[PDB]
Design a protein around this nucleic acid. Structure first.
Ligand SMILES: [K+]
Ligand SMILES: [K+]
Ligand SMILES: [K+]
Ligand SMILES: [K+]
Ligand SMILES: [K+]
Ligand SMILES: [K+]
Ligand SMILES: [K+]
Ligand SMILES: [K+]
Ligand SMILES: [K+]
Ligand SMILES: [K+]
Ligand SMILES: [K+]
Ligand SMILES: [K+]
Ligand SMILES: [K+]
Ligand SMILES: [Mg+2]
Ligand SMILES: [Mg+2]
Length: 1334
RNA sequence: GGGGGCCACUAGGGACAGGAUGUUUUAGAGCUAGAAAUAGCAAGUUAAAAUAAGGCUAGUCCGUUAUCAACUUGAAAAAGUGC
DNA sequence: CAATACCAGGCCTGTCCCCAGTGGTCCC
DNA sequence: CCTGGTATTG
C-alpha cells in the first residue's frame, strides 16, 4: 500500500489530502469512541484544519512596557513623598492620607473630603486664587515669600509626575531663548562672510514672523518678503529654511556639481554638513552653526509663547495665557450668542450630547470636534472675526492639558522645579539638603541599555549589579554596572562567527574588517593590455600600491581612477581592460577616512603597532552610544591625542556588526605558510585565492581548523525550532499544525511512510505609513502638492491616488502634470510586464497618462522614456518616493533591457519555489521522514518532499475547468491540497530530472520554451501552430505510465465532487486581556467589574464585557427562591480569563462560590471556543462563548453549480475567444442552475441555518432582481453564501438589500445534543450524548 | 540546485528606556423664584488617584505572545490508544 | 426568551539586534 | 474590520 500526501499551508488553514497510485483518495472506517450508539464512521482521507490567526508579541510588549512606566511614575511620587514626610507631618499629619483617598466617596473616606487643606473655606480660597496648577507653579517660581509646604509639594509633584520628554541632550535656555537675537547673529555672520552683498534686516520683526503659528514654508515666505532683492531659494533663504525645519538644497548656493541637501532632523546631518564644509571650506561652518542655534530658538518659541524676561516660568506663563484668553473669548462668545442667536445658547452651553462648549468641557467632544461644530456658528454671526482667526490657528478656547503638550522638554519643567526649590529652600532646610535629590528624581531615567532592574525573576532582564542593594535614582551609577549592562545589551543579540562559533564578530566599521573586504574584492581583479598574452591577477605589490595610492586617499575608488591614477601613472599603460569590478569598487575604507579627518595623523593610522588601539576605539564607538561612557572608555588613550581630537572622537559613533571575527580574518594561521586569511588576501603568489577558496582549500589548514572549531550545542524541540524560524508567527503556527497533521496522517496509514509529500505555501495603520512616506518625500522634494491638494491617510488606500502623490502629481513616462479628478482616465502600468513578473505591488507599478507611452509592451520601458525621465526618477528615488529596485527596473533599458536569460529566469521563478521559509518546512518534514543512512553513510531518501508554487495548480484549475470559489465553503483548501499532490507526483514522474529543482535534498531560449511548456503533457492539444499529444503520457525511460487523459481527469472530478470532506476548526482556549479596556461610569448592573478590590462598581464604575477563556458544563443543584430549595440544573458557565486561575486551582470551591451545590466533579466538561455540537438532522453548532453559538455545518454545493458560478460571475485571463464563446454558451444554456442554486441554499438553510426572516428576505431579494444580467445575479449569489458559511454569522448584501446577521443568542440546546471531540484531522472522533447527563 | 562575503535598497520579527492625551470617582460652596415639576441666570479651562483583578519570588520584579480534541497511566512531565 | 442597535484604547519619541526579498559582484 | 457583550424594547 503506497500513497502520497498533499499539503496546502496557510495563515488560517492547513489543507491535507491522501492519494494513491491512481490519484484516488482512499476512504476508511474509523472507530468512534464515546457513549452513543455509533461505533464507527466512514471518512475520506481529505480535509482541512482551520484556526484563528497566530498573533505577534507586539501588543503584549506595549502593555508590559506601559505597566513598568506606571509603576515607576508611582515610585517617583513615592520618593518625593518620602522626602517630605517629617516636615509635612509637622504641618498637616493627614495631607498625604487625603491625597491617597481622593478617589473615594465621602462615605468611604476616613478623613475630611477637601484634599489640600481639609476645610471648605481654605479649599475654595485656594481654587479662587489658583484656578490652574500653572498659576501656583508660576507663583512659587516668581514670589519670594515663604509658602505653604502642601502647595510646594503639589507643584513639585505635578512637575515630576508629568515631566516631559528626553529627546534633547544637555541643558536648555543657553541664551538660545531669543529668536530676535539669534536671527541678528545669523545676519551678522552672513554679512561677515559676504561683505559685498549685505542684507538689510532693520525693521524686520523676526520674532513675530518666525514664531508665528504657521507652516514652515509660509513663515519662510513672510520673512523673505521683508527683504528686498532676496529670494527664498538664495543662500540666506536656504539658511532660514534650514532653521525652520525644511530640507533646503545648498547646491546652487555654492555652485556645487553635487547635491547638498540638509535637514537638522536627519541622522546624517553631522556628516552631511562635514561633507559640505569639505568643499567650500571651513569659513562657512560658523554660518551653519548660527543657523542651527536659530533653529533651536524657534523650536523653543513654539512652546514658550510668552516673554521670558517678566518671569522665570515661561511655560506656566504660557498656560496662564491660554487660560486668560479662554476666559475672555468665552465671555465674548457667550455675550455674542445671547445677543444674536438666543435660541442656540442652551444647545451650545448646556447640551453635553452636542459638540458645543458643554460637550467640549463636560462631554466627550475633542478640541477638533468642537472647532468643527462651532466654525459655522462663528461664521454665521458678526463680531467673530478674531475668534475665527484663533480658530483657524488652533488657538481658541484652549485647555492646558492637551494632546500637543508632548513637545515640552523635561529641561523646562526642571527649570521651574529648580526655581521653586531655590525660592523655598531659604525657609525649609530639608529642601536645601534634598534639592539635588529631587532634581534627580525628575531627571533620572533607566538607560535603555540597562533594561528592567530585576533580581533574577524577569525573562526580559539582562542587567548586572555592582553590589547587592536596592537601586534608587540617587545610587544608580554606583549599584548598576552600566558598562557590563550596556555590553550585555548588544552581546545577547548579536551573532557569533559561524566559522569560529566561540568568537565574537567584528564591528562593521572596524578598520581590520574594511581592509578585509577591500582586499577580498581587489584580489579577484584582472587586467589586459596589448603586449600581454592573457589577463593577469594583481600581485601583492600592485594591490598594496593601489590600496596606499587610491583607497587611502579617496572614500570611493572608481574604475576610471584605477585606470588613470594607477595603471597610467605607475604602469604607463594608455589602454587597459579591467574585469572583476564595474563602475567603482563596492568595498571602501570609510573608517580610515573618518579617523584621518578626526586625528589628522596618517602615519599613526598606517603604523601596524597601533592596530590594536584603533580596533578598541572603533569597538567603543560601536558598542556604546552614551557619550559619557564613550568618554570614560576612551580615557585610557587620552595621552595619545589632543583634547580637541578627543572631543571630535567621542562625538563620532558607529552602528552595526560584521559577519566574521577577528580571529578568522587575522588570527588563525596556515600551518606551513604561517599566514593569516588577510595575509593571503594581501598576497597569494599567482593564485589570488579569496575567502571561500582559502577556507575550502584542502592544501591549507584553515578548513580543518574551522571544522575542528565547530560545535552543535543542544538541539531544539520541534516547537522551539519553528519559533526560531524567520517568518510571521501566523505562518509559523500553520507550519506547526502541518507537521502535526502529517504525523497523524502517517499514524492513519499504519505507520507506513508515504512516497511523496507535496507542499504549497500561500503568499503573504498602514495608511499611516503611506501618509508618512508621502509627507517625507514631498517635504524632501520641496513640493507644495499637499498645500494645493490635502489628503487623509484613508484616501491613500486608493492605488491611483497613492501613485499620484508618490509621483509628485506627474506622469512617470512623460514630463507633464497629472490631474487628480482625471485619475479614472489614466493607466497603471507594470514596469516589467506582468506576463514575466507577477508583481502587483507599488514597487512594480507606475501611474501614467496612457500605457502606450511606455513604448513596446513586451519588455522594460524603452530607451527614449529612460533618457527623458531618468533625472526626474532620480529625484523621486532620493525622496524615497520610489525604491532602488523600482528605479533600476525603470532604467534597465539603458543596460540592455530584458535579456532572454531574464525572461527564462522569470518564467522559472513563476514555477520553482525559492522562499526560505518553504525550504525550512521542507527540511523539517524531510528530516522527520528520512532517518536511515546507506552503506556510504549518505541519507536514504524514502520520502520525497516536493515544493510547488500556487501558480501551477492555479493554471491547472483554470485550464481543465476545476474552478474554485472561496466564498462557497471551506473545501477549496482541501481541494488545493489534493491537486497539489496529484500535480506534484505526476510532474516528478514524467520528468525525473526535475527532482533537483522540486525535491528537497542535495540556451536561454531553450529553458524559456521548456519551462513555459513544462505542463503541456497534461493537455491533449497545445497551441503554441497546433500540436497534439497522445492520450496516454508515460515516462520516457522507465516506460511507466504517468497520466491517462481518458481516466485520470474523471478521477480528479470525482474527488472534487465528494461531499464528505473533513473540515475541522481548531478549538482554542481564549487568552489575552480580561475585558474591554474602557473604564465605564458607575451604573446599577452586575455586569460591571471592580477596577480595584474595594472599588464597588456601583459607586466608582469599572469594566464590563469580559472574555470567556473556556466554558464549563456544570451538573449540580442551585438554591431556588426565598426558601433556598435545591433544584437540579445543567448549564454552561463561562470561566473568564480573569477567573481561570482561581477556577483551576480548585474547581469545586470556585463553583460553590458561584452558587452551585453538589457538583458532579467527574461530569465537568471543559469546552473551549469552537467546540462542536451535533443536533438533529445533521445540524451542527460551534461554541462561540458561554451564551452564543456559531454555524457548524458546511454547504457541499455540487461541482456543476460551482463551475457555473465561476464562469457566470467572471471570476478571473479568459483565453481563446472561441473558448470564451463556448463558456458563455454553457452559461446561457444552464440558466436554470441559478434557481437550483437558490433551492440548494434554501434546503440547507431550513435544515441547518434556521434564520426564517433572513431566508425570506433573501428569497424576496432574489425574486426582485430576476431581470438583472446573469453576471450580476451570480456575483450576488456569491454573497448569498455568507448566510450558510461556517462560523460566526455575518451581515451581507444582495445587490442593494442588506441582510443583518442572525445570531444564536442561546446555548441551552447544546446541553442535550451530542458533543464531538475531533483529532487534528477529524478522522478520530469521540462523541458524547449530553442528554444522558443529569 | 544549496551556501558565503561585499555594495545598494526594501521588508518583516524581537527587546528595552521614555512622552502626551483619554477615561473613571472625588475636590473646585452655584444663585434666585417657587413647598415641589421646573424656570431665569451664573459658572466651566485645574487637581488627586487608578490605569488590566492582582502575585510572591518582594524586585524601582512579574501579570494580554507562543502552546492546547478526547481517553489511560500519570503529581505533572509526557508516553500510549482506534485497520 | 427574541430581535436590534451600539460598542470596542488608540496616538507619539529614541536605542539596538536578527532573518529575508530584489538587483548586482566575487567565490565554495 | 469582526464578532461577542450589553442595554432597550418587546
Ligand atoms: K468621612
Ligand atoms: K524679497
Ligand atoms: K471633552
Ligand atoms: K560596483
Ligand atoms: K553605537
Ligand atoms: K592629551
Ligand atoms: K484573540
Ligand atoms: K493564545
Ligand atoms: K550573494
Ligand atoms: K523595527
Ligand atoms: K464638582
Ligand atoms: K481539535
Ligand atoms: K517602538
Ligand atoms: Mg498596579
Ligand atoms: Mg489627566
Amino acid at each position: 500500500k503506497k500513497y502520497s500526501i498533499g499539503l496546502a499551508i496557510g495563515t488560517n488553514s492547513v489543507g491535507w489530502a491522501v492519494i494513491t497510485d491512481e490519484y484516488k483518495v482512499p476512504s476508511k472506517k474509523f472507530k468512534v469512541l464515546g457513549n452513543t450508539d455509533r461505533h464507527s464512521i466512514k471518512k475520506n482521507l481529505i480535509g482541512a484544519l482551520l484556526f484563528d490567526s497566530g498573533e505577534t508579541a507586539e501588543a503584549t510588549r506595549l502593555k508590559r512596557t506601559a505597566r513598568r512606566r506606571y509603576t515607576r511614575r508611582k515610585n517617583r511620587i513615592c520618593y518625593l513623598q518620602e522626602i517630605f514626610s517629617n516636615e509635612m507631618a509637622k504641618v498637616d499629619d493627614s495631607f498625604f492620607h487625603r491625597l491617597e483617598e481622593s478617589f473615594l466617596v465621602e462615605e468611604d473616606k476616613k478623613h475630611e473630603r477637601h484634599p489640600i487643606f481639609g476645610n471648605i473655606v481654605d479649599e475654595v480660597a485656594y481654587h479662587e486664587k489658583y484656578p490652574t496648577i500653572y498659576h501656583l507653579r508660576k507663583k512659587l517660581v516668581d514670589s519670594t515669600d515663604k509658602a505653604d509646604l502642601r502647595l510646594i509639594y503639589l507643584a513639585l509633584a505635578h512637575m515630576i509626575k508629568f515631566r516631559g520628554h528626553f529627546l534633547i541632550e544637555g541643558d536648555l535656555n543657553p541664551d538660545n531663548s531669543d529668536v530676535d537675537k539669534l536671527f541678528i547673529q545669523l545676519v551678522q555672520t552672513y554679512n561677515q562672510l559676504f561683505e559685498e552683498n549685505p542684507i538689510n534686516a532693520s525693521g524686520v520683526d523676526a520674532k513675530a514672523i518666525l514664531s508665528a503659528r504657521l507652516s514652515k514654508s509660509r513663515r519662510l515666505e513672510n520673512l523673505i518678503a521683508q527683504l528686498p532683492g532676496e529670494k527664498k531659494n538664495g543662500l540666506f533663504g536656504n539658511l532660514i529654511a534650514l532653521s525652520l525645519g525644511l530640507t533646503p538644497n545648498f547646491k546652487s548656493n555654492f555652485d556645487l556639481a553635487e547635491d547638498a541637501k540638509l535637514q537638522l532632523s536627519k541622522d546624517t546631518y553631522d556628516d552631511d554638513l562635514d561633507n559640505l564644509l569639505a568643499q567650500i571650506g571651513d569659513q562657512y561652518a560658523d554660518l551653519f552653526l548660527a543657523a542651527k542655534n536659530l533653529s533651536d530658538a524657534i523650536l523653543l518659541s513654539d512652546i514658550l509663547r510668552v516673554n521670558t524676561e517678566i518671569t522665570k516660568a515661561p511655560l506656566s506663563a504660557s498656560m496662564i495665557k491660554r487660560y486668560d484668553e479662554h476666559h475672555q473669548d468665552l465671555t465674548l462668545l457667550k455675550a455674542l450668542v445671547r445677543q444674536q442667536l438666543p435660541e442656540k445658547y442652551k444647545e451650545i452651553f448646556f447640551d453635553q450630547s452636542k459638540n458645543g462648549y458643554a460637550g467640549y468641557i463636560d462631554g466627550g467632544a475633542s478640541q477638533e470636534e468642537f472647532y468643527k461644530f462651532i466654525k459655522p456658528i462663528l461664521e454665521k454671526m458678526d463680531g467673530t472675526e478674531e475668534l475665527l482667526v484663533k480658530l483657524n490657528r488652533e488657538d481658541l478656547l484652549r485647555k492646558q492639558r492637551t494632546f500637543d503638550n508632548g513637545s515640552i522638554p523635561h529641561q523646562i519643567h526642571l527649570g521651574e522645579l529648580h526655581a521653586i526649590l531655590r525660592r523655598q529652600e531659604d525657609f525649609y532646610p530639608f529642601l536645601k539638603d534634598n534639592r539635588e535629590k529631587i532634581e534627580k528624581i525628575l531627571t533620572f531615567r533607566i538607560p535603555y541599555y540597562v533594561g528592567p532592574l530585576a533580581r533574577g525573576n524577569s525573562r526580559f532582564a539582562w542587567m548586572t549589579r555592582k553590589s547587592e542593594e536596592t537601586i534608587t535614582p540617587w545610587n544608580f551609577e554606583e549599584v548598576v554596572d552600566k558598562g557590563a549592562s550596556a555590553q550585555s545589551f548588544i552581546e545577547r543579540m548579536t551573532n557569533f562567527d559561524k566559522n569560529l562559533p566561540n568568537e565574537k564578530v567584528l564591528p562593521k566599521h572596524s578598520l581590520l574588517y574594511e581592509y578585509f573586504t577591500v582586499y577580498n574584492e581587489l584580489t579577484k581583479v584582472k587586467y589586459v593590455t596589448e603586449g600581454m598574452r592573457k589577463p593577469a591577477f594583481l600581485s601583492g605589490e600592485q594591490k598594496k600600491a593601489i590600496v596606499d595610492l587610491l583607497f587611502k586617499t579617496n572614500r570611493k575608488v572608481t574604475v576610471k581612477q584605477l585606470k588613470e591614477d594607477y595603471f597610467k601613472k605607475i604602469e604607463c599603460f594608455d589602454s587597459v581592460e579591467i574585469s572583476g569590478v564595474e563602475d567603482r569598487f563596492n568595498a571602501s575604507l570609510g573608517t580610515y577616512h573618518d579617523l584621518l579627518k578626526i586625528i589628522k595623523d596618517k602615519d599613526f593610522l598606517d603604523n601596524e603597532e597601533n592596530e590594536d588601539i584603533l580596533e578598541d576605539i572603533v569597538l567603543t564607538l560601536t558598542l556604546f552610544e552614551d557619550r559619557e561612557m564613550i568618554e570614560e572608555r576612551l580615557k585610557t588613550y587620552a595621552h595619545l591625542f589632543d583634547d580637541k581630537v578627543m572631543k571630535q572622537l567621542k562625538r563620532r559613533r558607529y552602528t552595526g556588526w560584521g559577519r566574521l571575527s577577528r580571529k578568522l580574518i587575522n588570527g588563525i594561521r596556515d600551518k606551513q605558510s604561517g599566514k593569516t586569511i588577510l595575509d593571503f588576501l594581501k598576497s597569494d603568489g599567482f593564485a589570488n585565492r579569496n575567502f571561500m577558496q582559502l577556507i575550502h582549500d584542502d592544501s591549507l589548514t584553515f578548513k580543518e581548523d574551522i571544522q575542528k572549531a565547530q560545535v552543535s550545542g543542544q538541539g531544539d524541540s520541534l516547537h522551539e525550532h519553528i519559533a526560531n524560524l524567520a517568518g510571521s508567527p501566523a505562518i509559523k503556527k500553520g507550519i506547526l499544525q502541518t507537521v502535526k497533521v502529517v504525523d497523524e496522517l502517517v499514524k492513519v496509514m499504519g505507520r507506513h511512510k508515504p512516497e511523496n509529500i507535496v507542499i504549497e505555501m500561500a503568499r503573504e495603520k498602514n495608511s499611516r505609513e503611506r501618509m508618512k512616506r508621502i509627507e517625507e518625500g514631498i517635504k524632501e522634494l520641496g513640493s507644495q502638492i499637499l498645500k494645493e491638494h490635502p489628503v487623509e491617510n484613508t484616501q491613500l488606500q486608493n492605488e491611483k491616488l497613492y501613485l499620484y502623490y508618490l509621483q509628485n502629481g506627474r506622469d512617470m513616462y512623460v514630463d507633464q502634470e497629472l490631474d487628480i479628478n482625471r485619475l479614472s482616465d489614466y493607466d497603471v502600468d507594470a514596469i516589467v510586464p506582468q506576463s514575466f513578473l507577477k508583481d502587483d505591488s507599488i514597487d512594480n507599478k507606475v501611474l501614467t497618462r496612457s500605457d502606450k507611452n511606455r513604448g513596446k509592451s513586451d519588455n522594460v520601458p524603452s530607451e527614449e522614456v529612460v533618457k527623458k525621465m531618468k533625472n526626474y526618477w532620480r529625484q523621486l528615488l532620493n525622496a524615497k518616493l520610489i525604491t532602488q529596485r523600482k528605479f533600476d527596473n525603470l532604467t534597465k533599458a539603458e543596460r540592455g533591457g530584458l535579456s532572454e536569460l531574464d525572461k527564462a529566469g522569470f518564467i522559472k521563478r513563476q514555477l520553482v519555489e525559492t522562499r526560505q521559509i518553504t525550504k525550512h518546512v521542507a527540511q523539517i518534514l524531510d528530516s522527520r521522514m528520512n532517518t536511515k543512512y546507506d552503506e556510504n553513510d549518505k541519507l536514504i531518501r524514502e520520502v520525497k518532499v516536493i515544493t510547488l508554487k500556487s501558480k501551477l495548480v492555479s493554471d491547472f484549475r483554470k485550464d481543465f475547468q476545476f474552478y474554485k470559489v472561496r466564498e462557497i465553503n471551506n473545501y477549496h483548501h482541501a481541494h488545493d491540497a489534493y491537486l497539489n499532490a496529484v500535480v506534484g507526483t505526476a510532474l516528478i514522474k514524467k520528468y525525473p530530472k526535475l527532482e533537483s529543482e522540486f525535491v528537497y535534498g542535495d540556451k536561454a531560449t531553450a529553458k524559456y520554451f521548456f519551462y513555459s511548456n513544462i505542463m503541456n503533457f497534461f493537455k491533449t492539444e497545445i497551441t503554441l501552430e497546433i500540436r497534439k499529444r497522445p492520450l496516454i503520457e508515460t515516462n520516457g525511460e522507465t516506460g511507466e505510465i504517468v497520466w491517462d487523459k481518458g481516466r485520470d481527469f474523471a478521477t480528479v472530478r470525482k474527488v472534487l465532487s465528494m461531499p464528505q470532506v473533513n473540515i475541522v476548526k481548531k478549538t482554542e482556549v481564549q487568552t489575552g486581556g480580561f475585558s474591554k479596556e474602557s473604564i465605564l461610569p458607575k451604573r446599577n448592573s452586575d455586569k460591571l467589574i471592580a477596577r480595584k478590590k474595594d472599588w464597588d462598581p456601583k459607586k466608582y464604575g469599572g469594566f464590563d464585557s469580559p472574555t470567556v477563556a473556556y466554558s464549563v458544563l456544570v451538573v449540580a443543584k442551585v438554591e431556588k427562591g426565598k426558601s433556598k430549595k435545591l433544584k437540579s440544573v445543567k448549564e454552561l458557565l463561562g470561566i473568564t480569563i480573569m477567573e481561570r486561575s482561581s477556577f483551576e486551582k480548585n474547581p469545586i470551591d470556585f463553583l460553590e462560590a458561584k452558587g452551585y451545590k453538589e457538583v458532579k466533579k467527574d461530569l465537568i466538561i471543559k469546552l473551549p471556543k469552537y467546540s462542536l455540537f451535533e443536533l438533529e438532522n445533521g445540524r451542527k453548532r460551534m461554541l462561540a462563548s458561554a451564551g452564543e453559538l456559531q454555524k457548524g455545518n458546511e454547504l457541499a454545493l455540487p461541482s456543476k453549480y460551482v463551475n457555473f458560478l465561476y464562469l457566470a460571475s467572471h471570476y478571473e485571463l479568459k483565453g481563446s475567444p472561441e473558448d470564451n464563446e463556448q463558456k458563455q454558451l454553457f452559461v446561457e444554456q444552464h440558466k436554470h442552475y441559478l434557481d437550483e442554486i437558490i433551492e440548494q441554499i434554501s434546503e440547507f438553510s431550513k435544515r441547518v441555518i434556521l434564520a426564517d426572516a433572513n431566508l425570506d428576505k433573501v428569497l424576496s431579494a432574489y425574486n426582485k432582481h430576476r431581470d438583472k444580467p446573469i453576471r450580476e445575479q451570480a456575483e450576488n449569489i456569491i454573497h448569498l453564501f455568507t448566510l450558510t458559511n461556517l462560523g460566526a454569522p455575518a451581515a451581507f448584501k444582495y445587490f442593494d438589500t442588506t441582510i443583518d446577521r442572525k445570531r444564536y443568542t442561546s446555548t441551552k440546546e447544546v446541553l442535550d445534543a451530542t458533543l464531538i471531540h475531533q483529532s487534528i484531522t477529524g478522522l478520530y472522533e469521540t462523541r458524547i450524548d449530553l442528554s444522558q447527563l443529569g
